Design a protein around this ligand. Structure first.
Ligand SMILES: Cc1cc2nc3c(=O)[nH]c(=O)nc-3n(C[C@H](O)[C@H](O)[C@H](O)COP(=O)(O)OP(=O)(O)OC[C@H]3O[C@@H](n4cnc5c(N)ncnc54)[C@H](O)[C@@H]3O)c2cc1C
Ligand SMILES: NC(=O)c1ccc[n+]([C@@H]2O[C@H](COP(=O)([O-])OP(=O)(O)OC[C@H]3O[C@@H](n4cnc5c(N)ncnc54)[C@H](OP(=O)(O)O)[C@@H]3O)[C@@H](O)[C@H]2O)c1
Length: 511
């Protein structure tokens, strides 16, 4: 029914910028879609208390508009969900993007029509769009992982998942249980502890966590940032992780024990997860001894913060210090509160939930009014895998990604022509907005090139896609241990630009 140049799926950072680029810069008629009733993406969905960025406020945003960077403000060194949502809502209205989005609208299929070199895209309300290009900015919020504890139906109190937090809902003065201690669960717990009648935490795997050091800013302090913003973004885009600190090249074991502690202590006092992992020493992710030095420093902090050694034993992180580091606003301190109990479910599993609360295998009823699930989601490619997406010859995305999801360059995959991914598989591990910008700017250039020239279809070769996996795999082999590209933002940007400069190396082009 509707003939458009381009379709964008999602209205988070990625979809917002994709619609801007395609509409404003390339002059294409572009429609965006989100199941959400408004823009924001993950910042629209996740409204739990204590929801906070792990990227400093001044860097958790777009950098493409130099005037916008002068204009935005923020209250603290890290940024909260309502502030981010407001920022993204403001971007949408600043660039008049709203009239291009269809909200409350799920894309249920995207089928390639081989004969016409078009994508046929349908919504859950039956609307059909024919488009030359599809840009998928669908994020990771797939189906909500909402675990199957026996007797859950019987609970007479409120059951809440953090990705569907009730707007009014304050749990002040209530008896609350939280299941899950990832970034989200830690954040909810710290938020809840001081206001809740009682808090019971069901801990399965304690994680490494460092202080975030979220502090109020002055208007003079924002003024300093803003006067140097160009240099700041120049540095970020020339770094590996783009978080606003100088990345260390210092081997942890090349200095004395006393200096190593001082270095760790400084980062601990300053705050920041990536700063702790990458700002202290150059080999925490690559050297077993370096990782142990970091890991055991955090363990010692846990033991020092938590008074009761039985409580401390349950919360004690173990093993390698890896993946996205967690940071917190006083998470370990919380367990020193008289009205907070930790339950280590590996050794004392949940037997059932009843009307009144949770019974553990010890046979003790933990009486609760409220049960919070901070249990995350199931999958990461989940959002691709639940849409009927069909490429060339009717090849389904699930048949194509028979094993793990793959991409060429993080943005495209073979047999799916003119179909792009923002933050697809095998892409950078990074402060995300500047990587998102990198990918959308590259997607847009590639679509510009296709439109300028005669291009009917562009897709990666199977061999390019395989060499990219091999490339990612060889970077990942160096590290300690989903497959990301781990060469960093600066390296990723050079790779993307060179692919473009080399006449789209690794793409099959139908002229
Ligand atoms: C609490 C929290 C804090 C975070 N902090 C940071 C941080 O500090 N730094 C950082 O770099 N990253 C952080 N992240 C990661 C974050 O996801 C990214 O920074 C960024 O918001 C991702 O934007 P996105 O557009 O790629 O995806 P999303 O924001 O996830 O948006 C995708 C949208 O696509 C929509 N969608 C999916 N499928 C369909 C469909 N079939 N039809 C219609 N719509 C669909 C969804 O409804 C969703 O709104 C954080 C995440 C969380 C949850
Ligand atoms: N960039 C950011 O600052 C940021 C912030 C928040 C979230 N995120 C991302 O968003 C995703 C969601 O984060 P999240 O913290 O909500 O989820 P998460 O990281 O997957 O954490 C889930 C927690 O729930 C526990 N759990 C899962 N199933 C359980 C069950 N059946 N019974 C008991 N416990 C169970 C897990 O323990 P186990 O460890 O044993 O599985 C874990 O503690 C993550 O992938 C994360 O990377 C990013």
């Amino acid at each position: 029914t509707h003939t458009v140049d381009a379709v964008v799926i999602g209205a988070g950072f990625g979809g917002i910028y994709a619609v801007h680029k395609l509409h404003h810069e390339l002059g294409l008629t572009t429609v965006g879609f989100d199941k959400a009733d408004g823009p924001g993406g993950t910042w629209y969905w996740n409204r739990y208390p204590g929801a906070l960025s792990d990227t400093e406020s001044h860097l958790y945003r777009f950098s493409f508009d130099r005037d916008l960077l002068q204009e935005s403000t923020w209250k603290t060194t890290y940024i909260t969900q309502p502030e981010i949502l407001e920022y993204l809502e403001d971007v949408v209205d600043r660039f008049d993007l709203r009239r291009h989005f269809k909200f409350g609208t799920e894309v249920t299929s995207a089928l390639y029509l081989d004969d016409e070199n078009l994508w046929e895209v349908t919504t859950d309300h039956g609307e059909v769009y024919r488009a030359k290009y599809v840009v998928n900015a669908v994020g990771l919020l797939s189906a909500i992982n909402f675990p199957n504890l026996p007797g859950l139906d019987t609970f007479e109190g409120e059951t809440i998942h953090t990705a569907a937090w009730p707007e009014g809902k304050s749990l002040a003065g209530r008896r609350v249980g939280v299941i899950g201690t990832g970034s989200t669960g830690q954040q909810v717990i710290t938020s809840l502890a001081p206001e809740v009648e009682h808090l019971t935490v069901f801990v399965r795997t304690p994680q490494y966590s460092v202080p975030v050091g979220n502090r109020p800013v002055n208007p003079e302090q924002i003024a300093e940032i803003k006067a140097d913003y160009d240099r700041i973004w120049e540095r970020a885009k020339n770094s590996a992780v783009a978080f606003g600190f100088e990345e260390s090249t210092l081997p942890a074991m090349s200095v004395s024990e006393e200096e190593r502690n001082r270095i760790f202590q400084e980062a601990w006092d300053h705050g920041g997860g990536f700063r702790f992992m990458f700002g202290t020493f150059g080999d925490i992710a690559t050297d077993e001894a370096a990782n142990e030095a970091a890991a055991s420093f955090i363990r010692a902090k846990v033991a020092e913060i938590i008074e009761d050694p039985e409580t401390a034993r349950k919360l004690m992180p173990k093993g390698l210090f890896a993946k996205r580091p967690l940071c917190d606003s006083g998470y370990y301190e919380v367990y020193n509160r008289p009205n907070v109990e930790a339950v280590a479910i590996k050794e004392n599993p949940i037997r059932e939930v009843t009307a009144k609360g949770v019974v553990t295998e010890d046979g003790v009823l933990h009486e609760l009014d409220v049960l919070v699930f901070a249990t995350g989601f199931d999958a990461v490619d989940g959002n691709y895998r639940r849409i009927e997406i069909r490429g060339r010859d009717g090849l389904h995305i699930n048949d194509h990604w028979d094993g793990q999801p793959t991409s060429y360059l993080g943005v495209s995959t073979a047999n799916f022509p003119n179909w792009f991914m923002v933050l697809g598989p095998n892409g950078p591990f990074t402060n995300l907005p500047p990587s998102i910008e990198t990918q959308v700017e590259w997607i847009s250039d590639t679509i510009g090139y296709a439109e300028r020239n005669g291009v009917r279809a562009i897709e990666p070769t199977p061999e390019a896609e395989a060499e990219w996996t091999e490339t990612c795999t060889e970077i990942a082999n160096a590290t300690l241990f989903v497959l990301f590209y781990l060469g960093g933002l600066r390296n990723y940007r050079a790779v993307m630009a060179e692919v473009a400069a080399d006449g789209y190396r690794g793409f099959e082009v139908k002229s």
